[PDB]
Scaffold this active site. Structure first.
Site, PDB file in Angstrom:
ATOM      1  N   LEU A  26       4.084  -2.224  -9.758  1.00 42.21           N
ATOM      2  CA  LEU A  26       2.548  -2.263  -9.660  1.00 42.21           C
ATOM      3  C   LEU A  26       2.200  -2.126 -11.029  1.00 42.21           C
ATOM      4  O   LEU A  26       0.683  -1.916 -11.367  1.00 42.21           O
ATOM      5  CB  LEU A  26       2.097  -0.897  -8.743  1.00 42.21           C
ATOM      6  CG  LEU A  26       2.630  -1.036  -7.515  1.00 42.21           C
ATOM      7  CD1 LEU A  26       2.656   0.101  -6.557  1.00 42.21           C
ATOM      8  CD2 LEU A  26       2.149  -2.300  -6.633  1.00 42.21           C
ATOM      9  N   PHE A  48      -3.397   6.248  -4.138  1.00 41.07           N
ATOM     10  CA  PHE A  48      -2.210   6.188  -3.429  1.00 41.07           C
ATOM     11  C   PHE A  48      -1.264   7.330  -4.551  1.00 41.07           C
ATOM     12  O   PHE A  48      -1.558   7.277  -5.595  1.00 41.07           O
ATOM     13  CB  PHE A  48      -1.102   5.093  -3.294  1.00 41.07           C
ATOM     14  CG  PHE A  48      -1.207   4.284  -4.641  1.00 41.07           C
ATOM     15  CD1 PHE A  48      -1.947   3.385  -5.207  1.00 41.07           C
ATOM     16  CD2 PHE A  48       0.326   4.293  -5.173  1.00 41.07           C
ATOM     17  CE1 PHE A  48      -1.470   2.717  -6.313  1.00 41.07           C
ATOM     18  CE2 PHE A  48       0.543   3.378  -6.322  1.00 41.07           C
ATOM     19  CZ  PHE A  48      -0.404   2.693  -6.909  1.00 41.07           C
ATOM     20  N   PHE A  61       8.160   5.158  -1.045  1.00 42.38           N
ATOM     21  CA  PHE A  61       7.398   4.612  -1.940  1.00 42.38           C
ATOM     22  C   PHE A  61       6.086   5.035  -2.332  1.00 42.38           C
ATOM     23  O   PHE A  61       5.958   5.498  -3.410  1.00 42.38           O
ATOM     24  CB  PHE A  61       6.969   3.048  -1.132  1.00 42.38           C
ATOM     25  CG  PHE A  61       8.315   2.222  -1.341  1.00 42.38           C
ATOM     26  CD1 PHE A  61       9.018   2.214  -0.068  1.00 42.38           C
ATOM     27  CD2 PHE A  61       8.538   1.232  -2.222  1.00 42.38           C
ATOM     28  CE1 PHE A  61      10.012   1.421  -0.021  1.00 42.38           C
ATOM     29  CE2 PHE A  61       9.434   0.365  -2.319  1.00 42.38           C
ATOM     30  CZ  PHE A  61      10.348   0.524  -1.143  1.00 42.38           C
ATOM     31  N   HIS A  69      -2.490  -1.955 -10.723  1.00 41.51           N
ATOM     32  CA  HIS A  69      -3.025  -0.846 -10.259  1.00 41.51           C
ATOM     33  C   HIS A  69      -3.392   0.402 -11.418  1.00 41.51           C
ATOM     34  O   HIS A  69      -2.359   0.546 -12.321  1.00 41.51           O
ATOM     35  CB  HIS A  69      -2.137  -0.113  -9.236  1.00 41.51           C
ATOM     36  CG  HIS A  69      -2.171  -0.974  -7.875  1.00 41.51           C
ATOM     37  ND1 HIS A  69      -3.047  -0.968  -7.018  1.00 41.51           N
ATOM     38  CD2 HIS A  69      -1.227  -1.797  -7.782  1.00 41.51           C
ATOM     39  CE1 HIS A  69      -2.828  -1.732  -6.056  1.00 41.51           C
ATOM     40  NE2 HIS A  69      -1.637  -2.419  -6.603  1.00 41.51           N
ATOM     41  N   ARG A 104      -1.971   5.179   5.379  1.00 38.28           N
ATOM     42  CA  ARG A 104      -0.518   4.494   5.071  1.00 38.28           C
ATOM     43  C   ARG A 104       0.372   5.365   4.427  1.00 38.28           C
ATOM     44  O   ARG A 104       0.106   5.916   3.242  1.00 38.28           O
ATOM     45  CB  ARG A 104      -0.913   3.426   4.477  1.00 38.28           C
ATOM     46  CG  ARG A 104       0.487   2.584   3.783  1.00 38.28           C
ATOM     47  CD  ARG A 104      -0.124   1.159   3.019  1.00 38.28           C
ATOM     48  NE  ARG A 104      -0.679   0.411   3.906  1.00 38.28           N
ATOM     49  CZ  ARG A 104      -1.550  -0.609   3.389  1.00 38.28           C
ATOM     50  NH1 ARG A 104      -1.979  -0.612   2.059  1.00 38.28           N
ATOM     51  NH2 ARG A 104      -2.249  -1.374   4.455  1.00 38.28           N
ATOM     52  N   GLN A 129      -0.881   6.732   0.771  1.00 39.17           N
ATOM     53  CA  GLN A 129      -2.024   6.162   0.201  1.00 39.17           C
ATOM     54  C   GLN A 129      -3.146   6.526   1.488  1.00 39.17           C
ATOM     55  O   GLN A 129      -2.952   6.784   2.456  1.00 39.17           O
ATOM     56  CB  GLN A 129      -1.735   4.598   0.439  1.00 39.17           C
ATOM     57  CG  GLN A 129      -3.207   3.784   0.299  1.00 39.17           C
ATOM     58  CD  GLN A 129      -3.261   2.255   0.293  1.00 39.17           C
ATOM     59  OE1 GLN A 129      -2.154   1.693   0.184  1.00 39.17           O
ATOM     60  NE2 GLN A 129      -4.306   1.636   0.353  1.00 39.17           N
ATOM     61  N   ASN A 158      -6.326  -1.312  -4.651  1.00 42.97           N
ATOM     62  CA  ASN A 158      -7.360  -2.213  -4.914  1.00 42.97           C
ATOM     63  C   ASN A 158      -7.000  -3.483  -4.059  1.00 42.97           C
ATOM     64  O   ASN A 158      -5.976  -3.354  -3.217  1.00 42.97           O
ATOM     65  CB  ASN A 158      -7.513  -2.778  -6.474  1.00 42.97           C
ATOM     66  CG  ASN A 158      -6.089  -3.200  -6.958  1.00 42.97           C
ATOM     67  OD1 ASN A 158      -5.711  -4.311  -6.466  1.00 42.97           O
ATOM     68  ND2 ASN A 158      -5.736  -2.691  -8.026  1.00 42.97           N
TER      69      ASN A 158
HETATM   70  C1  ZNI Z   1       7.549  -7.135   1.569  1.00 40.99           C
HETATM   71  C2  ZNI Z   1       6.875  -5.862   2.285  1.00 40.99           C
HETATM   72  N1  ZNI Z   1       6.063  -4.964   1.282  1.00 40.99           N
HETATM   73  C3  ZNI Z   1       6.571  -3.933   0.437  1.00 40.99           C
HETATM   74  C4  ZNI Z   1       8.092  -3.574   0.387  1.00 40.99           C
HETATM   75  C5  ZNI Z   1       8.490  -3.846  -0.908  1.00 40.99           C
HETATM   76  C6  ZNI Z   1      10.130  -3.430  -1.370  1.00 40.99           C
HETATM   77  N2  ZNI Z   1      10.686  -3.724  -2.620  1.00 40.99           N
HETATM   78  C7  ZNI Z   1       9.733  -4.441  -3.727  1.00 40.99           C
HETATM   79  C8  ZNI Z   1      10.231  -4.042  -5.046  1.00 40.99           C
HETATM   80  N3  ZNI Z   1      11.838  -4.046  -5.444  1.00 40.99           N
HETATM   81  C9  ZNI Z   1      11.979  -3.719  -6.548  1.00 40.99           C
HETATM   82  C10 ZNI Z   1      12.172  -4.471  -7.950  1.00 40.99           C
HETATM   83  C11 ZNI Z   1      13.294  -4.041  -7.022  1.00 40.99           C
HETATM   84  C12 ZNI Z   1      12.480  -3.558  -4.192  1.00 40.99           C
HETATM   85  C13 ZNI Z   1      12.044  -4.088  -2.854  1.00 40.99           C
HETATM   86  C14 ZNI Z   1      10.864  -2.978  -0.354  1.00 40.99           C
HETATM   87  N4  ZNI Z   1      10.152  -2.657   0.772  1.00 40.99           N
HETATM   88  C15 ZNI Z   1       8.816  -2.812   1.110  1.00 40.99           C
HETATM   89  C16 ZNI Z   1       7.994  -2.777   2.640  1.00 40.99           C
HETATM   90  C17 ZNI Z   1       8.697  -1.093   3.116  1.00 40.99           C
HETATM   91  O1  ZNI Z   1       8.811  -3.473   3.677  1.00 40.99           O
HETATM   92  C18 ZNI Z   1       7.901  -3.623   4.699  1.00 40.99           C
HETATM   93  C19 ZNI Z   1       5.510  -3.691  -0.449  1.00 40.99           C
HETATM   94  C20 ZNI Z   1       4.227  -4.150   0.460  1.00 40.99           C
HETATM   95  C21 ZNI Z   1       2.763  -4.277  -0.049  1.00 40.99           C
HETATM   96  C22 ZNI Z   1       1.896  -5.002   0.585  1.00 40.99           C
HETATM   97  C23 ZNI Z   1       2.237  -5.909   1.565  1.00 40.99           C
HETATM   98  C24 ZNI Z   1       3.692  -6.055   1.858  1.00 40.99           C
HETATM   99  C25 ZNI Z   1       4.716  -5.276   1.411  1.00 40.99           C
HETATM  100  C26 ZNI Z   1       0.596  -4.928   0.297  1.00 40.99           C
HETATM  101  C27 ZNI Z   1      -0.647  -5.382   1.019  1.00 40.99           C
HETATM  102  S1  ZNI Z   1      -2.173  -4.484   0.300  1.00 40.99           S
HETATM  103  C28 ZNI Z   1      -1.284  -4.078  -1.038  1.00 40.99           C
HETATM  104  N5  ZNI Z   1      -0.014  -4.155  -0.816  1.00 40.99           N
HETATM  105  C29 ZNI Z   1      -2.222  -3.228  -2.053  1.00 40.99           C
HETATM  106  C30 ZNI Z   1      -3.258  -2.280  -1.303  1.00 40.99           C
HETATM  107  N6  ZNI Z   1      -4.406  -2.443  -1.159  1.00 40.99           N
HETATM  108  C31 ZNI Z   1      -5.179  -2.205  -0.190  1.00 40.99           C
HETATM  109  O2  ZNI Z   1      -4.658  -1.125   0.533  1.00 40.99           O
HETATM  110  C32 ZNI Z   1      -6.549  -2.385   0.064  1.00 40.99           C
HETATM  111  C33 ZNI Z   1      -7.311  -2.360   1.292  1.00 40.99           C
HETATM  112  C34 ZNI Z   1      -8.844  -3.130   1.498  1.00 40.99           C
HETATM  113  O3  ZNI Z   1      -9.394  -2.950   0.330  1.00 40.99           O
HETATM  114  C35 ZNI Z   1      -9.247  -1.489  -0.137  1.00 40.99           C
HETATM  115  C36 ZNI Z   1      -7.744  -1.311   0.363  1.00 40.99           C
HETATM  116  C37 ZNI Z   1      -2.920  -1.006  -2.326  1.00 40.99           C
HETATM  117  O4  ZNI Z   1      -3.586  -0.940  -3.367  1.00 40.99           O
HETATM  118  N7  ZNI Z   1      -1.706  -0.348  -2.511  1.00 40.99           N
HETATM  119  C38 ZNI Z   1      -1.791   0.811  -3.180  1.00 40.99           C
HETATM  120  C39 ZNI Z   1      -0.266   0.683  -4.011  1.00 40.99           C
HETATM  121  C40 ZNI Z   1       0.810   0.180  -2.989  1.00 40.99           C
HETATM  122  C41 ZNI Z   1       0.373  -0.728  -2.138  1.00 40.99           C
HETATM  123  N8  ZNI Z   1      -0.754  -0.367  -1.296  1.00 40.99           N
HETATM  124  C42 ZNI Z   1       1.643  -0.532  -0.834  1.00 40.99           C
HETATM  125  O5  ZNI Z   1       1.321  -0.172   0.368  1.00 40.99           O
HETATM  126  O6  ZNI Z   1       2.540  -0.841  -1.065  1.00 40.99           O
HETATM  127  C43 ZNI Z   1       3.983  -0.774  -0.438  1.00 40.99           C
HETATM  128  C44 ZNI Z   1       5.190  -1.012  -0.879  1.00 40.99           C
HETATM  129  C45 ZNI Z   1       6.181  -0.484  -0.047  1.00 40.99           C
HETATM  130  C46 ZNI Z   1       5.344  -0.119  -2.231  1.00 40.99           C
HETATM  131  C47 ZNI Z   1       5.295  -2.482  -1.260  1.00 40.99           C
END
Ligand code: ZNI
Ligand code: ZNI
Ligand code: GNP
Ligand code: GNP
Ligand code: MG
Ligand code: MG
Lengths: 170, 163, 163, 168
Positions: B121, B112, B59, B125, B54, B62, B101
């Site tokens: 986060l 990540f 951002f 995290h 990912r 991962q 997580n």
């Molecule tokens: C609304 C869309 N959207 C956004 C997001 C948000 C924003 N913002 C929010 C913040 N605002 C600020 C105050 C102003 C501005 C606008 C903009 N655009 C986007 C995106 C690009 O639009 C599609 C996100 C995001 C994250 C999730 C789902 C949807 C999301 C999500 C699903 S699962 C998880 N998160 C935790 C996951 N767990 C697992 O993977 C499990 C798997 C099985 O067991 C082991 C393993 C995990 O640990 N990580 C490690 C950590 C980062 C994390 N993934 C991840 O990918 O974050 C993505 C991202 C882009 C940082 C956030």
């Protein structure tokens, strides 16, 4: 959070919309012709010491689908209007794209940059002054580019962002 | 003392470059040790050969799933999962290394690398290191990400170990 | 009589099933013979092993780039490209087999199979065949497409030839 | 050309939105947990004799990003609201996804469908009657599903297209 800017790359088929985008995104030159359906990309960049997120929509030029451009012009914030400096018809096509963007946006004040691409090529048919005069009449910037050498690629996308910032008055 | 580990990153098998990390064993020793040991492979399993599944430009990058290689797996050196050690350190900017997580106390091997501040986060995290050298390689990895994180080329840890 | 060719389709290497086509050599002999020969591989090159690179549910499945395997290539048995033979036949419904192109007189090896009536392609793409058996395989292939045509699994012509 | 429709699946994480969506789209069951960021799917179907194109947006139920759910809620023509019959919390949360959608879309009447998922499990915490009684109050259909066994999948989404067309 960083500000996201919704850029849309438009123009006739074959002018280099995709090659320009792929240079920005991946820093290499697509020598092959893969006519586009629709592709979206994301890249964070520093413009004027400010980090922002570019969301780039790379569009199809296919004339058969000209009436289905409306939806993405509706959502796009600024437009890269691309012709090739060796294709007079692509330059003539610019008028139609601009008019459509204004019509769909119902505004005379839409962020746009005029891009003359393939400036590495010797067999030019559109004069720089030709393009400058038109961009001047439109009130928008004009940048000559080459997706092959990378000349002007950053400048074109960064300039469009600057125009978006301006039109938002920020 | 804080150990340093390295990933050698490849793009569709082509070497891209080396990313090194300082691991904050002085604040999160259990979490640092896990990542350290998985980077050396010294317990018979770890990150070598696994991919970054990912990549979301703006951002984070991962990876860490070396049991299933599809983004749902991973295990720690302590068992399938271990507790959130603490949230002393925060997601302050690019280069932060933190645990993925699926809820409280579900740390495994997935991690990540932040390419921006991600303060929402914080407290959720466990942050446990930071890029030392090779941030430009993490930036280059964003070339192959997308809005929903699907990657356009296969990004792998071709080698990794302790420095 | 009009020849018949088959594709054995696979998904990430797993058999999906066989689709066969009637080639309308009675109306487009040059275009039909290209597709036949490319299906047998008898010229030393052809469809076996290539992928369906573009699948757009509601419209069509497109393949036939066996030279670059990226959607930009392919070549005919007549040279890289050949002229449009005629536009007698229309894109009347699902199962229609038609030539992809990049404008007038640029037929190579890429082709598409309609999953709906695509009448606006009439007079622009040479129709030269139709699915005989296995249209449900083509329907099954849509499950792996998307809006812009990128596929979510590798859809291959695992084998092909003449019946 | 066939009419296109825009469906949107919502609910707390783990209920099986993706597992349901993928069973509708690919006739595959996902036994592993891969929480969603955002995914879009396209499928052509015939509903009540009319061929149509379904454009389905599969969302994440992470509370952190509720603010941006809003955009999803703007574009979508109707909503599949999933909870899991062994997850009382995901059932309690259903109220919340409902309030938000009514808000964002400014109405009391948005094409909508409640789904009790995983009805294959011997454990159960949310009685059928509970979900029936709650669906009644809101004025929308209730369907128990199992992505594992493929029970109820098609009905949920078609019923949802049928609820769009009705309101349409
Ligand atoms: C609304 C869309 N959207 C956004 C997001 C948000 C924003 N913002 C929010 C913040 N605002 C600020 C105050 C102003 C501005 C606008 C903009 N655009 C986007 C995106 C690009 O639009 C599609 C996100 C995001 C994250 C999730 C789902 C949807 C999301 C999500 C699903 S699962 C998880 N998160 C935790 C996951 N767990 C697992 O993977 C499990 C798997 C099985 O067991 C082991 C393993 C995990 O640990 N990580 C490690 C950590 C980062 C994390 N993934 C991840 O990918 O974050 C993505 C991202 C882009 C940082 C956030
Ligand atoms: C505007 C969006 N959009 C659509 C489209 C359109 C519609 N309709 C139009 C018709 N209306 C009905 C009368 C009312 C309803 C609304 C709906 N939704 C969409 C899509 C899903 O929105 C993303 C399309 C489409 C097609 C192109 C570009 C954009 C397109 C395009 C690019 S290149 C080409 N087309 C020809 C291409 N050439 C090469 O690949 C060259 C490569 C190099 O040299 C060898 C090789 C080729 O031969 N084929 C073989 C033939 C089908 C064809 N591809 C293709 O893929 O069409 C896809 C699609 C979906 C059928 C059309
Ligand atoms: N010499 C040169 N060739 C270029 C340049 N930009 C694009 N090309 C070539 O022009 C052809 C078309 O490029 P492409 O990026 O696909 O054009 P497009 O505008 O995206 N086409 P479409 O509307 O079909 O998607 C390709 O062969 C590409 O290599 C340039 O700056 N210089
Ligand atoms: N027993 C059983 N398990 C199911 C069923 N449907 C899904 N599961 C399992 O439940 C877990 C959650 O599935 P998933 O589809 O990812 O749920 P989700 O609602 O999409 N989660 P998210 O909101 O994060 O995207 C997975 O292990 C899946 O295999 C079902 O009907 N029965
Ligand atoms: Mg293009
Ligand atoms: Mg999901």
């Amino acid at each position: 959070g960083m500000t996201e800017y919704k850029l849309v790359v438009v123009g006739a088929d074959g002018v280099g919309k995709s090659a320009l985008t792929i240079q920005l995104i991946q820093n290499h030159f697509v020598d092959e012709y893969d006519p586009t359906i629709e592709d979206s990309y994301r890249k964070q960049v520093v413009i004027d010491g400010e980090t922002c997120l570019l969301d780039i929509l790379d569009t199809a030029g296919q004339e058969e689908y000209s009436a289905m451009r409306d939806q993405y012009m509706r959502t796009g914030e600024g437009f890269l209007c691309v012709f090739a400096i060796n294709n007079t018809k692509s330059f003539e096509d610019i008028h139609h794209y601009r008019e459509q963007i204004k019509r769909v946006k119902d505004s005379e004040d839409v962020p746009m940059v005029l891009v003359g691409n393939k400036c590495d090529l010797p067999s030019r048919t559109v004069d720089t002054k030709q393009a400058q005069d038109l961009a001047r009449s439109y009130g928008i910037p004009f940048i000559e580019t080459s997706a092959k050498t990378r000349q002007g690629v950053d400048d074109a996308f960064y300039t469009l962002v600057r125009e978006i910032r301006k039109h938002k008055e920020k | 003392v804080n150990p340093t580990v390295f990933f050698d990153i490849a793009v569709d098998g082509e070497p891209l470059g080396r990313v090194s990390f300082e691991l904050f064993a002085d604040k999160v020793p259990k979490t640092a040790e896990n990542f350290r040991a998985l980077s050396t492979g010294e317990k018979g399993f770890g990150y070598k050969g696994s991919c970054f599944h990912r990549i979301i430009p703006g951002f984070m990058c991962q990876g860490g799933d070396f049991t299933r290689h599809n983004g749902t797996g991973g295990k720690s050196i302590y068992g399938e999962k271990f507790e959130d050690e603490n949230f002393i350190l925060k997601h302050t900017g690019p280069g932060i290394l933190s645990m993925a997580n699926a809820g409280p106390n579900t740390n495994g091997s997935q991690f990540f690398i932040c390419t921006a501040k991600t303060e929402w986060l914080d407290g959720k995290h466990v942050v446990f290191g930071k890029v030392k050298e090779g941030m430009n390689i993490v930036e280059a990895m964003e070339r192959f990400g997308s809005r929903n994180g699907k990657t356009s080329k296969k990004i792998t840890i071709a080698d990794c170990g302790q420095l």
